Design a protein around this ligand. Sequence first.
Ligand SMILES: Nc1ncnc2c1ncn2[C@@H]1O[C@H](COP(=O)(O)OP(=O)(O)O)[C@@H](O)[C@H]1O
Ligand SMILES: CCCC[S@](=O)(CC[C@H](N)C(=O)O)=NP(=O)(O)O
Ligand SMILES: [Mg+2]
Ligand SMILES: [Mg+2]
Ligand SMILES: [Mg+2]
Length: 672
Amino acid sequence: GLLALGTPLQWFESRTYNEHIRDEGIEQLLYIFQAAGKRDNDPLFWGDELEYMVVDFDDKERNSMLDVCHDKILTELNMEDSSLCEANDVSFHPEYGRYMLEATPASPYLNYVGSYVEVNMQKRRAIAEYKLSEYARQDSKNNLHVGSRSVPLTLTVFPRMGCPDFINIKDPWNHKNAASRSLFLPDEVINRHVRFPNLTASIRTRRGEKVCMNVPMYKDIATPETDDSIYDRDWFLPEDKEAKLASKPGFIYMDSMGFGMGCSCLQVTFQAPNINKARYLYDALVNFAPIMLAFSAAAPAFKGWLADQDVRWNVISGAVDDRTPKERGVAPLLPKYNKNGFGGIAKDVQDKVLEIPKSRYSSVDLFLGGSKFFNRTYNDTNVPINEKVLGRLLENDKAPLDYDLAKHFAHLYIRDPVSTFEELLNQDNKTSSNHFENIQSTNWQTLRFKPPTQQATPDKKDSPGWRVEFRPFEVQLLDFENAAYSVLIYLIVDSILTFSDNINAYIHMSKVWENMKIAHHRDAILFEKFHWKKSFRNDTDVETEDYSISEIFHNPENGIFPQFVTPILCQKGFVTKDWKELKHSSKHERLYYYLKLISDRASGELPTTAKFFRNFVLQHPDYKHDSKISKSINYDLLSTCDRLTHLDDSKGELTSFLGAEIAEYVKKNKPS
Ligand SMILES: Nc1ncnc2c1ncn2[C@@H]1O[C@H](COP(=O)(O)OP(=O)(O)O)[C@@H](O)[C@H]1O
Ligand SMILES: CCCC[S@](=O)(CC[C@H](N)C(=O)O)=NP(=O)(O)O
Ligand SMILES: [Mg+2]
Ligand SMILES: [Mg+2]
Ligand SMILES: [Mg+2]
């Protein structure tokens, strides 16, 4: 669904309501617990969110651009073509990028739904390409976007973001981009819904410096020693003078929110039976997050460069990192503009500013606890909290909370609201969660623990309950892959929820954080090791060893297949003994190829999308052994991606990417 209208407040004007917004959202949250705290026996509803990028192929010029001119698609799919969507069980909404689409099923899946995830993902995609073909008929007749061919691709990263000729707007630099003030992204990369340029502007003003994301450059025989795309400019002070100071030799420099929030992911959200199981599930999924990031890697290039990393995470982390240099415990790059390293923080609250170790977009900070295996000593890392919020969640007359749950919320509330509408400044806290949502939705982490609304009282059985969002997955090109990875986590969640008396997944948080750094390394999946529990079926045991992704998926004692997946499949009767029995299942064959694809990637038998892209660039005739992705390499890569998406093996690319057995299989068998 399309986002409702508002008048955003810009940072200088909105910062004055930070405490008001925090206070009133805490009250809203208290009403939610008071109303929905005792929900129970909620069904296992779940659903995915896919994010897409609309790419314009200029086949005559050999240039694939991002398409920032067909964003009406989102309004039309939510207006006069919404009937198409509803009939087809899909729903569409905006994302940060003006070229992006997001789509979900219109109703959650319930329990195990087989091939229907993939069916539903194919329908989302077929409806987007339908709309796009309609525009191509209109444009033809109005003689517009002549030569151009727009295709939705589930890319994690656009390899040429912020590089010359990367958007289908002639001469986008003939005006200034006051929102991001980036050297590379015109503000047309941003979706027109006012929230998005608001967040962009708000986060930069608060920080008092452009966002800054330095990603290690892959080092080839002829790679420049610096990011030679940086340039001096004079539109904006201080921002146009930052790059010289902020960049680093051997690092890709990115300076704008769209480099991160202009990237895409797969997400899956699950409803637990009640809040307690929701805490248990959340805690248990914490170390799956860095593992699945590493496993799904789909981002080996940024801003026209091959990177020495394989996932998007740290780039998105920096893109919305509103921390002043004070909060980061570093000097302002330009002390004359960034007064005392406080950026846009009001002086009459600079005395309350904390040093905060992680960006508001970062891995989970705290186990919620509240289950039998939990011990507060597993929360062993630096996690600042808003003490006032903790105090109030502990002592109040609506819903006093246990200390571990209170500390989760209090950590979330160390942040300021960065997107605030004038209209919404005073709410009815009994019925509204908008203020709480303000902070909740702008703490972006590897999981999200989702309260219901005040409306979701236990008697109302169909309301959304206590939910856990699983956020780390990179998005893959094929709907077959995304459904494989969606069902994977489904089966892991069902496993956790089913065997909850016996699964101890606790490890020290400091280890998870370390895993998150390791998951970024180039080819991590193929050789790096990760702290993973030695056993899950052991009261009090929180011993880890360091296991490869292959061992983490396949070890009999602690592996995802033998301890999570296979046990749930036996238990639900899909198999007697082993997951591989599905190959010869009459009802369940596709589930076999889903799992086989996963296992073969986890063992290094099939490449990740990140590796496939990297090979593609490195093996390209025009590649100049210097780390650069040119318009021409970009064009061929994305043509390949278009063929892969569409199971087009005419050039053997699908066989090359999925191997013969899976390729032949998806080419001859449609999900149904
Ligand atoms: N009751 C429910 N339990 C679990 N998941 C749900 C439920 N209702 C909807 N979902 C799924 O939650 C996700 C919500 O998507 P979205 O509106 O994109 O929210 P957000 O951006 O906050 O994650 C979708 O995948 C949707 O299918
Ligand atoms: C600025 C708005 C961001 C909304 S978002 O957090 C983006 C997810 C990101 N594209 C990623 O690759 O991790 N998805 P949702 O809010 O639909 O869960
Ligand atoms: Mg969403
Ligand atoms: Mg999203
Ligand atoms: Mg989401």
